Design a protein around this ligand. Structure first.
Ligand code: GTP
Ligand code: MYR
Lengths: 49, 339, 394
């Protein structure tokens, strides 16, 4: 019924960022386990790494 | 006095120990500690709070004069929607500590620039529009910020920008040759980024009234002008302390940082807001009038600004109510947003 | 033993984070038991440490007796030396053989009761000579009321930089003198016998005059023995570079000590990581008298000194990762200058290495810094007011 410090309540205050969580799973895919023994970074990605 | 004395007792003992004394708060995460403020997140009956603790290692320092100004600044901004003032200032929270309490906001604009989802071009404009509206609502209310930077321009989870950490206590004018004022008061993020209006740096020959003379409205327009340039570059600062003092003397210019901005209309806006001569900087309200349609879509003024203000209101539209209201208004929203 | 027991004696941790305090208490109970479960030769260490503790406790009790303010320095010194030789109630003169806390290899038989005297300062640092088993006297300074943890850290990090540069065969002849906090307000420091440069210029008038009085030789460029001036050149370069990276703050000549062999060293570290009570301090400990010892910017010594500085700097950048990781673990270590800004502390040290500059550009940066820092004579002016303040305290 009352508030004096938190003027602008935010419903997503301490919730997990589901959009960021979605980007984890796609960008860091484990299914490449068998491919990554063969496939390795090329000239342009060697420098970058 | 903390700058001259530099004595260790309160500072070594600082941060979590303070919360052991106060009842309504639990420490939650130190957001940052500096010589000046020991800032920690706390849990509170109303939600997350940010507490900036100052160690009063000088009993002669007349903090009551800062306390008065804090309560007065709060009363003015009490109805500025995009402005979140420090809601409480307790002089006697501990034997030698003073605490400034305000709402904790989901993200600061510096984080939000890099956290996901990335702000779409329309969203960067919506935030820039609210930055101008925040300084505007402060200026018309009769308050100046004095330290507008992406770390103080907060953003709720629904892109509602809240300008915070009004710098009534930080010095208005700073000696050009002595960084000891900038470092203690302004560089709390240590990024070296300087968004302080160049007319605020003065020769030692100009110098205690210079420390607390009133902030000029055009001093915030410069700061906000740099926040928008940083936002549209995605974290690239407009000026560092070496580059700003060189900019003040006309020996530097952010040509390479501004050319980085994609939106030609925002680069024009920023080039004006950051113009060196303070008299050549218009009121924030004049940039809103000038950019209506030119950079901020007409929708922002006519519908988005007055509609979103519904949620910034303290009367709690809970997560269920907000959804039910948007569902009710959905037809009106599609109409107002798609012609 | 001493590191963990400092935490167990840390009455602040006992109240601000008791969970961490009790952890150290259990670390000490574990170590107490792990030694008892060791071999016969290991179990003896448990009893040796128990002896060290009561030895230091009795030493603290003697200093607490002096601290009672029962009279002037005369009566204090009398009580001090009388208690030391009290072979019945204290016997610190000839206590049973114990490894010395500050340096355990230098086993001690007791304090020589004739030699103990407190220096003329508000901290009352007591000079102590330890009767080693080898029959030699080992010089140590015992301090009371001073939390040596800041010096302890800042010395144990220069000892590493000295060691690391020795791995590069660049022995700059630093003096990483040892310091050890026995408690939050008690500890020992290695008493490197030397004269402060403030006293050198008050007695011989100049560093070169002092070297001519204790190491003269016509073979050197200015009448100073080549082996002494070369030591000074490298010692100055080492402390200049290392105090710049560690951001050591104060510059008082009263705390820059000079050895007769030319090893210069700095003993005041109460102000580090960029902070100095004097506003706008110079960037580094490169006072003009330090350069006068080399005969100014025109001498061969200055050309070599600059070469040693940029080389010592360039090789610490090689080990920046190691140095930084040793601060991240220290971020919560209660060191006064770290507790001011814990999350910024590591960022401050990382700033000094200029890791973004390429190696040739890092030389030019350091070169520009030293070529400019000679002219920041403001600290040499303001230090005259500090001496005036001390005149009222003597
Ligand atoms: N998400 C979020 N981050 C915050 C909030 N307050 C502070 N921070 C972050 O914590 C840091 C430390 O707090 P501040 O002392 O306010 O830092 P600052 O705003 O740059 O310094 P000031 O201008 O003196 O207020 C900031 O740089 C932000 O990155 C907040 O309310 N919400
Ligand atoms: C001198 O070196 C220290 C000057 C400190 C000025 C800043 C004080 C900030 C006070 C905030 C308001 C507290 C109200 C109880």
């Amino acid at each position: 019924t009352s508030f004096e410090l938190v003027k602008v309540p935010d419903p997503q205050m301490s919730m997990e960022n589901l959009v960021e969580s979605k980007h984890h799973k796609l960008a860091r895919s484990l299914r490449s386990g068998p491919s990554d023994h063969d496939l390795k970074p090329n000239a342009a990605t060697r420098d970058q790494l | 006095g903390n700058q001259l004395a530099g004595i260790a007792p309160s500072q070594i003992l600082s941060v979590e120990s303070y919360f052991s004394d106060i009842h309504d708060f639990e420490y939650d995460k130190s957001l940052g500690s500096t010589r000046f403020f020991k800032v920690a997140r706390a849990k509170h009956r109303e939600g997350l709070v940010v507490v900036k603790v100052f160690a009063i290692q000088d009993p002669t320092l007349p903090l009551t004069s800062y306390k008065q100004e804090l309560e007065e600044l709060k009363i003015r901004l009490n109805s500025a929607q995009n402005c979140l003032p420090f809601q409480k200032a307790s002089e006697k929270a501990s034997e030698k500590a003073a605490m400034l309490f305000r709402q904790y906001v989901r993200d600061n604009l510096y984080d939000r620039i890099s956290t996901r989802p990335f702000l779409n071009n329309i969203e960067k404009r919506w935030i820039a529009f609210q930055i101008l509206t925040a300084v505007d609502q402060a200026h018309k209310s009769g308050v100046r910020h004095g330290d507008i930077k992406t770390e103080n321009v907060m953003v709720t989870s629904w892109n509602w920008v809240l300008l915070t950490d009004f710098a009534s206590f930080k010095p208005t004018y700073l000696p050009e040759d002595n960084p000891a004022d900038f470092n203690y008061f302004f560089d709390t993020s240590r990024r070296r980024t300087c968004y302080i209006a160049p007319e605020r740096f003065v020769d030692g020959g100009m110098f205690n009234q210079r420390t607390r003379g009133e902030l000029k409205r055009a001093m915030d327009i410069f700061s906000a002008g740099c926040v928008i340039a940083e936002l549209f570059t995605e974290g690239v600062p407009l000026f560092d302390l070496s580059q700003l003092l060189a900019y003040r003397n006309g020996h530097f210019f952010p040509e390479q940082v501004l050319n980085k901005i994609e939106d030609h209309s925002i680069r024009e806006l920023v080039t004006q807001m950051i113009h060196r001569e303070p008299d050549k900087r218009l009121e924030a309200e004049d940039y809103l009038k000038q950019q209506r349609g030119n950079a901020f879509p007409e929708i922002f003024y006519t519908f988005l600004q007055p509609y979103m203000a519904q949620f910034a209101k303290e009367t709690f539209l809970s997560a269920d109510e907000r959804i039910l209201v948007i569902r009710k208004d959905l037809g009106n929203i599609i109409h107002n947003l798609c012609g | 033993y001493w590191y963990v027991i400092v935490e167990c004696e840390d009455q602040d941790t006992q109240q601000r984070d008791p969970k961490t305090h009790e952890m150290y208490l259990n670390v000490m109970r574990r170590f107490s038991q792990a030694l008892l479960k060791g071999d016969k030769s290991v179990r003896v260490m448990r009893s040796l440490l128990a002896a060290q503790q009561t030895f230091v406790d009795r030493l603290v009790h003697l200093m607490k007796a002096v601290q009672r303010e029962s009279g002037n320095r005369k009566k204090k010194n009398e009580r001090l030396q009388a208690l030391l030789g009290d072979n019945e109630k204290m016997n610190l003169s000839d206590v049973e053989l114990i490894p010395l806390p500050l340096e355990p290899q230098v086993k001690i038989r007791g304090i020589i009761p004739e030699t103990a005297t407190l220096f003329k300062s508000a901290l009352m640092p007591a000079q102590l000579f330890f009767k080693t088993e080898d029959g030699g006297k080992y010089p140590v300074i015992f301090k009371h009321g001073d939390d040596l943890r800041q010096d302890q850290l800042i010395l144990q990090i220069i000892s590493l930089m000295d060691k690391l540069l020795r791995k590069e065969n660049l022995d700059l002849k630093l003096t990483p003198y040892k310091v050890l906090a026995t408690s939050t307000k008690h500890g020992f420091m290695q008493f490197i016998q030397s004269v402060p440069v403030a006293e050198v210029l008050d007695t011989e008038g100049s560093i070169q005059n002092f070297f001519r009085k204790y190491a003269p030789s016509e073979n050197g460029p200015n009448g100073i023995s080549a082996e002494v001036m070369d030591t000074y050149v490298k010692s100055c370069a080492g402390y200049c570079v290392i105090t710049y990276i560690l951001g050591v703050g104060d510059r008082h000549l009263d705390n820059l000590l000079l050895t007769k062999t030319g090893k210069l060293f700095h003993i005041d570290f109460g102000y580090i990581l960029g902070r100095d009570p004097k506003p706008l301090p110079p960037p580094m400990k490169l006072n003009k008298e330090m350069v006068e010892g080399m005969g100014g910017t025109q001498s061969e010594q200055y050309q070599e000194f600059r070469k040693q500085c940029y080389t010592a700097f360039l090789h610490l950048r090689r080990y920046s990762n190691l140095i930084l990781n040793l601060f991240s673990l220290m971020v919560d270590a209660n060191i006064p200058d770290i507790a001011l800004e814990p999350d910024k502390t590591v960022k401050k040290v990382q700033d000094k290495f200029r890791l973004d500059l390429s190696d040739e550009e890092a030389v030019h940066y350091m070169q520009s810094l030293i070529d400019e820092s000679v002219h920041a004579l403001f600290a040499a002016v303001v230090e005259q007011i500090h001496k005036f303040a001390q005149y009222w305290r003597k």
